[PDB]
Design a protein around this motif. Sequence first.
Motif, mmCIF file in Angstrom:
data_model
loop_
_atom_site.group_PDB
_atom_site.id
_atom_site.type_symbol
_atom_site.label_atom_id
_atom_site.label_comp_id
_atom_site.label_asym_id
_atom_site.label_seq_id
_atom_site.Cartn_x
_atom_site.Cartn_y
_atom_site.Cartn_z
ATOM 1 N N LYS A 170 31.142 50.710 43.347
ATOM 2 C CA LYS A 170 31.817 50.363 42.087
ATOM 3 C C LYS A 170 33.233 50.980 42.025
ATOM 4 C CE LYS A 170 29.259 50.650 38.367
ATOM 5 N NZ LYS A 170 29.801 49.314 38.036
ATOM 6 N N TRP A 171 34.118 50.394 41.235
ATOM 7 C CA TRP A 171 35.430 50.943 41.020
ATOM 8 C C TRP A 171 35.261 51.995 39.976
ATOM 9 C CZ3 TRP A 171 38.944 49.453 44.401
ATOM 10 C CH2 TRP A 171 38.731 48.234 45.096
ATOM 11 N N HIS A 172 35.557 53.263 40.318
ATOM 12 C CA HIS A 172 35.319 54.399 39.411
ATOM 13 C C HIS A 172 36.581 54.798 38.658
ATOM 14 C CE1 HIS A 172 32.677 57.621 37.865
ATOM 15 N NE2 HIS A 172 33.760 58.377 37.876
ATOM 16 N N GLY A 199 29.774 45.828 52.598
ATOM 17 C CA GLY A 199 30.295 44.606 53.205
ATOM 18 C C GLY A 199 30.838 43.534 52.272
ATOM 19 N N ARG A 200 30.711 43.667 50.947
ATOM 20 C CA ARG A 200 31.014 42.512 50.062
ATOM 21 C C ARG A 200 32.455 42.209 49.602
ATOM 22 N NH1 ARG A 200 29.004 39.175 52.515
ATOM 23 N NH2 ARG A 200 30.374 38.005 51.085
ATOM 24 N N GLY A 201 33.044 43.084 48.802
ATOM 25 C CA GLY A 201 34.297 42.707 48.124
ATOM 26 C C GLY A 201 35.437 43.218 48.962
ATOM 27 N N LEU A 202 36.510 43.633 48.300
ATOM 28 C CA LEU A 202 37.578 44.369 48.970
ATOM 29 C C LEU A 202 37.061 45.735 49.419
ATOM 30 C CD1 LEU A 202 40.588 43.480 46.708
ATOM 31 C CD2 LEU A 202 40.045 42.538 48.931
ATOM 32 N N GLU A 207 38.474 29.237 43.489
ATOM 33 C CA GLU A 207 37.019 29.344 43.520
ATOM 34 C C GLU A 207 36.511 30.459 44.419
ATOM 35 O OE1 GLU A 207 37.503 26.012 46.812
ATOM 36 O OE2 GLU A 207 38.742 27.091 45.354
ATOM 37 N N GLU A 208 37.190 30.693 45.549
ATOM 38 C CA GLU A 208 36.791 31.742 46.520
ATOM 39 C C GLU A 208 37.158 33.152 46.030
ATOM 40 O OE1 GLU A 208 37.656 29.169 50.635
ATOM 41 O OE2 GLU A 208 39.321 30.110 49.547
ATOM 42 N N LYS A 209 38.027 33.241 45.032
ATOM 43 C CA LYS A 209 38.361 34.527 44.428
ATOM 44 C C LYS A 209 37.161 35.278 43.839
ATOM 45 C CE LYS A 209 42.005 33.571 41.685
ATOM 46 N NZ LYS A 209 43.034 34.212 40.836
ATOM 47 N N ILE A 210 36.061 34.588 43.515
ATOM 48 C CA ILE A 210 34.802 35.232 43.087
ATOM 49 C C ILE A 210 34.251 36.209 44.108
ATOM 50 C CG2 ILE A 210 33.968 33.354 41.618
ATOM 51 C CD1 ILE A 210 32.339 32.244 43.873
ATOM 52 N N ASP A 211 34.545 36.014 45.397
ATOM 53 C CA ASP A 211 34.129 36.998 46.416
ATOM 54 C C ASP A 211 34.841 38.366 46.275
ATOM 55 O OD1 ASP A 211 32.513 34.990 47.674
ATOM 56 O OD2 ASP A 211 34.301 34.265 48.751
ATOM 57 N N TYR A 212 35.999 38.400 45.584
ATOM 58 C CA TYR A 212 36.831 39.607 45.353
ATOM 59 C C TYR A 212 37.028 39.728 43.821
ATOM 60 C CZ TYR A 212 37.410 38.548 50.267
ATOM 61 O OH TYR A 212 37.167 38.293 51.597
ATOM 62 N N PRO A 213 36.024 40.187 43.136
ATOM 63 C CA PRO A 213 36.067 40.019 41.652
ATOM 64 C C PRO A 213 37.157 40.819 40.915
ATOM 65 C CG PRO A 213 33.934 40.886 42.399
ATOM 66 C CD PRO A 213 34.694 40.513 43.646
ATOM 67 N N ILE A 214 37.721 41.870 41.520
ATOM 68 C CA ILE A 214 38.766 42.665 40.863
ATOM 69 C C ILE A 214 40.049 41.823 40.735
ATOM 70 C CG2 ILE A 214 39.792 43.854 42.881
ATOM 71 C CD1 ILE A 214 38.961 45.684 39.700
ATOM 72 N N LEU A 215 40.206 40.862 41.626
ATOM 73 C CA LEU A 215 41.307 39.937 41.570
ATOM 74 C C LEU A 215 41.273 39.176 40.284
ATOM 75 C CD1 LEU A 215 41.275 38.188 45.093
ATOM 76 C CD2 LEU A 215 42.523 40.213 44.346
ATOM 77 N N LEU A 216 40.071 38.731 39.914
ATOM 78 C CA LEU A 216 39.893 37.955 38.689
ATOM 79 C C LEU A 216 39.984 38.821 37.444
ATOM 80 C CD1 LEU A 216 36.796 35.970 39.958
ATOM 81 C CD2 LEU A 216 39.107 35.054 39.627
#
Length: 138
Positions: A40-42, A60-63, A86-95
């Motif tokens: 998680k981003w702390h 292995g998932r996000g950034l 649509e692919e931005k969901i793989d990097y949710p902090i972007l959204l």
Amino acid sequence: EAIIEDRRFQETLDKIRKEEGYDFAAIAFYESNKPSSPIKWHYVSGNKNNRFKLIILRKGRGLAGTVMKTGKRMVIANVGLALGPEEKIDYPILLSESLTAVLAVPLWYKNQVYGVLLFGQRDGRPLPKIFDNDDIQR
């Protein structure tokens, strides 16, 4: 107690965000010592909101997931060119933070990746010069 460590991470994150000229900065770590813990981003600096607290990333998932898996930095110089919206969901902090460029780097302690330091730009501001050579000033 450990309040002294939060202070120092937070102050250091802010200072480094401004001195480096970024709109956003964040630090991710494993949520717990439980050897299948998510990430998680702390800590954040220049956040628009707190929806980043909703992000739960497995190894292995996000950034943060990817940098912690590989031990290698990840750069997206232009999110719009690099990723379909649509692919931005793989990097949710972007959204959640509306980032249009990012740099994510590993934080090392005794040859082990203990976290991920993320720098972000908004509004098409470009990434300033990425000094290849850096330090983990912690």
